[PDB]
Design a protein around this ligand. Structure first.
Ligand SMILES: [Ca+2]
Ligand SMILES: [Ca+2]
Ligand SMILES: [Ca+2]
Ligand SMILES: [Ca+2]
Ligand SMILES: [Ca+2]
Ligand SMILES: [Ca+2]
Ligand SMILES: [Ca+2]
Ligand SMILES: [Ca+2]
Ligand code: NI
Ligand code: NI
Lengths: 359, 359, 359, 359
């Protein structure tokens, strides 16, 4: 018969980062994470993690995961049914925001558990195969001089053929100087993406984008606030560079309304906000219908399991917040990433967890 | 290690039908089926079947399945990857029509095999659970007087709370007489659906639908030709009764274009034409985004395995063409249908297959 | 000289409710609230409260309010600037959901402190006057027989000329019987509103609304999920009854996108989710441009201060969660509510707080 | 304890101007103003002024201000309520045009009185702070040769980083030669705006704007008549330079229709035509929803109090008609303008008023 959930625990950690990532709104210089364990009555504990953005989110997210989780004891391990139940539970309060991250975190852990119980990676459960997905190396604001060694190692050693950096921290001249430097340093055969992290308004985005058009950029990411779907659509209409967005939209319905608005050319759901594996698969069918190339936002380990069954799969984003607390950290080979199992391939390095844990 | 396909065989049968199903275009008085077996190297053979509509399609379908199957020998049993390969293979010739039915038939048999290999129903592989799905009993043209015994049995014994019949064979008076008779016999608490089988043009469909709105119909199905998405949309715009369609549209893209045109209020894909299980799941995401209740068209055994994971699941259509040749025929309990495994719950009663096989 | 914030504290309480409020998704039989205090350097502490929906949200919300407030300590008490600050702080994480309720709770407390500092009700600070706003009495599921006495009291003692109840818990017959009984009991000159609390899909909402059209309802509230803007709009297009929504949308952009999609005929923002007073005022300008009548969702004490400066002000919803812990609980006179100051008129009954506090 | 209005008086003056402002329709070489005084019963007199465009409007505006004011005797000083009363009073006759300017002038004086009564600048009453707003220096037709000294002072001494000039007075070659000369004199890092003052039709606007594309203009202002919203939208859709407009539109509804038509990329309401402070606040909500950057049209003293609470605040226009008759004339520092109080910071230099008064 089917495994049942027996308990749920969540722990907060703050991991270190070598590359401090400056963005238009400030700097992320550590990895605040929430580590989720779903125990079963069949000798398996499912695992997933959330990137929490800021230390302030950790305590609330832990309360949520554990309080939602407690009510799941005794329930059959059936992700689709569990997702429907969480939907009903939070219908009135709202599942956008921290609640939805807890819900998506739990979903990933349920699927990880199912994978473990079967001795297979999640990607095989989903009817696909674990194969190399094109990846890009995701940075904060870069400087072609100061960061040359790092970028050399990325492209030469790890084989990356795509790099993303950040802009909107200053004026247009600052963005242009950065991109011009990068394009000169990396040459014409490396893809370059630019992420504004929601920092512009539509008129200013249109203006900057037109002035960056000569650097052969692959996409412009979140040019304006994520909630501003109409403003994204306006920028998209006038842009000669594809518009990428989605990492901050909530659940399959959030994607359905963005697509209805025509907000972007590309999407990149975040597994923590799209409703975990279950919600991702829904959106994959939406993106196929809309002919929208679909990439992932961080959570590279889990994202590697869903991109191979995504009809319009595009890029996997490499930004490694969790490696320090994982038994088997992400590996990039020849600029690509392959899913690792069983489950999602998330098992904790407990000595490191103990070191970086916070309460 | 993942199973590989070793071979594919297809057999044609014509099963007997208790009651002839008269429609606007003719009569279906038997069940021309293609039974598909996909042998693997792990002691399991995946099964699925196609309803072929007419005996004329049997030989061509057998050939196509065997020809395509032969080319898949040695390949890993990975439904998503196999579907992508079949897509590329038929991109130029086209996979609408008989080729598409072959392709979808193969896909169902692959998932069936995965389920058998796991010892689980396909629905559990898909992250859902096998649970009772509301069903309706699907008839040809009915006559309340002549068909009372059958309808009493359907409602009183099998617990059906919804009945579908056919229209468009004659004039509007004929349709109205039929429906009025049925509604008087069955009372207000049984759902009634009406299927025109593509027999009207948009102006006539609009005219008939307005005159039938007093009988509290649940839906009007395929009022005009299935290819006529614009015509469906025009009927839908003017109709006070929900418009149902989709059993004849091809693959996830066929649904994406229909939805983009606003062809219908409800949809009911056929697993044989939507791209099997793999195609169905894509369309389930689209239907959720469009807020379109999604039902099934025939193939009730396999349909029972995908409706439980379909966000907008509506009705399962019960029309039993295959019962005669299955080891475990479809069961209806209290007007609902529950998925049976392992796999899709499709294993052949060989003595019956021998009896009804045509060559 | 402008006051500065010196600290922020939040306390959780669960207040008793005389009458349970059954809705389509469950029952609210208590008032889990978060009471917010913002101390200033000018002898005034600003107050606001949040209705938290479920006890599960209380600890995380208290954490968020205190943690955000800690970071505002030392800033000038300038609500427009503080809101810009909070926007930038949560731009990446997201301010939908619990975070947004904390942000809006803080905003209301800032304006409450300003009013206290001036010795004026907030409404006069906003260039308006404290004057009676039409109100309706907001119930759970009602039964005209069982609840005759309560409704008589509401109409005769408090002068209500409008009543709202809930539906969608069961089938259409149940909704119709409830509304039919209420219209028969109350007669044609009492306004009746029906709230589905997001429980239907668009097709089913359209079907039920058409059947309820003869009861002369004032509005149908949240017929489908709040996130489903395109779905609301599809319902609105087909509905002969005005569609009301908004109590679950986030900040002025959430309203801008809903209005752009044509989701509803009426709106009713919740001060906890629209961005407090500061967010409300922005939406008031949007609703004026769109000619959308604008009512409030709960928080009647604070809502009384903003409706008098809302160009399209419609109704104030009376649902009294907080009276138990207020020094001056809400009063309804002749079916209307008048704003009370100074500030928002929220000061705590500390003995009651001590009684109902939960930790 | 709310102040009541006791009387209203208005005086006409014609102030001298340093240099003529030539535009496509004529020359403004003086400042015909209406100075408005609202006396209250609490020892404060509210002040505002109108720019009247032409001496012909002075007598009628004085008449209207005094006649309307006379009917406000004894009314409570509540701007939102007074605006609604003025709306009802002029609904039939119409409040577009001279009546609307008198109405908006009164509103500004009411807010100024409230700020004076509180001992605070209006911006602080509105929940914002007095902070520097980026400004541009607003000229008539310029010649880079003849006007070099004036423009060097503007950019070097006063720190302006943005300059606006007028076009449409002759043919396209004239506009182009002028812009070319200005761009050469000012260099790349000074913003340049061009105001056609409604002098073109849409086809001619489209033709001229395309020819001015290479001069890096910030905006093209009122390319066609202000009432021609459809014509503005057509220019906007074809224009590669942002279209600015709005200085001549009437009240929040005038903006709502222009925004609904998609008339412009940017707007710049005139406090005299938008409905004073009260109407400006409504339109600020609209511009936020539409993501439209919002600047001011003249009345720089009062505009400095509302731009700080305008979510999409863009530029403050510096054109100083009133400095001659103010106790504290506008000050520009480092190309920015900061609100001064109390009230709107408008108090009259009575000896100057006497010198420039016309009767
Ligand atoms: Ca990003
Ligand atoms: Ca584009
Ligand atoms: Ca059919
Ligand atoms: Ca229709
Ligand atoms: Ca409600
Ligand atoms: Ca309607
Ligand atoms: Ca102008
Ligand atoms: Ca344009
Ligand atoms: Ni805690
Ligand atoms: Ni006169």
């Amino acid at each position: 018969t089917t495994a049942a959930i027996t308990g749920v625990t969540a722990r907060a950690v703050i991991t270190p980062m070598k590359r401090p990532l400056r963005n238009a709104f400030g700097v992320i210089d550590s990895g605040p994470l929430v580590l989720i364990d779903v125990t079963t009555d069949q000798g398996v504990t499912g695992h997933s993690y959330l990137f929490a953005y800021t230390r302030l989110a950790l305590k609330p997210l832990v309360h949520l995961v554990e309080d939602i989780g407690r009510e799941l004891a005794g329930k059959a391990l059936v992700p689709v049914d569990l997702m429907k139940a969480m939907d009903a539970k939070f219908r009135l309060l709202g599942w956008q925001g921290l609640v939805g991250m807890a819900v998506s975190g739990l979903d990933m852990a349920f699927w990880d558990a199912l994978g473990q119980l079967a001795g297979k990676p999640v990607v095989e459960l989903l009817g696909g195969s674990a194969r190399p997905i094109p990846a890009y190396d995701s940075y904060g604001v870069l400087d072609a001089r100061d960061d040359e060694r790092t970028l050399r190692t990325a492209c030469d050693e790890h084989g990356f053929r795509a790099i993303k950096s950040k802009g909107g921290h200053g004026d247009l001249a600052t963005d242009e100087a950065m991109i011009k430097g990068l394009r000169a340093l990396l040459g014409p055969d490396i893809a370059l993406m630019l992420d504004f992290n929601q920092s512009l308004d539509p008129a200013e985005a249109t203006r900057r984008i037109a002035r960056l058009a000569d650097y052969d950029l692959t996409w412009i990411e979140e040019p304006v606030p994520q909630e501003n779907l109409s403003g994204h659509a306006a920028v998209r209409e006038r842009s000669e560079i594809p518009i990428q967005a989605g990492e901050n939209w909530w659940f399959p319905r959030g994607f359905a309304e963005a697509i209805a608005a025509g907000a972007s050319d590309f999407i990149m759901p975040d597994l923590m906000k799209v409703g975990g594996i279950t919600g991702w698969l829904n959106v994959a069918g939406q993106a196929d219908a809309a002919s929208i190339p679909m990439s992932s936002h961080i959570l590279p380990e889990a994202s590697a399991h869903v991109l191979p069954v995504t009809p319009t799969a595009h890029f996997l984003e490499v930004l490694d917040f969790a490696g320090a607390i994982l038994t088997e950290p992400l590996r990039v080979i020849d600029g690509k990433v392959t899913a690792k199992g069983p489950g999602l391939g998330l098992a904790w390095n407990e000595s490191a967890v103990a070191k970086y844990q916070v309460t």
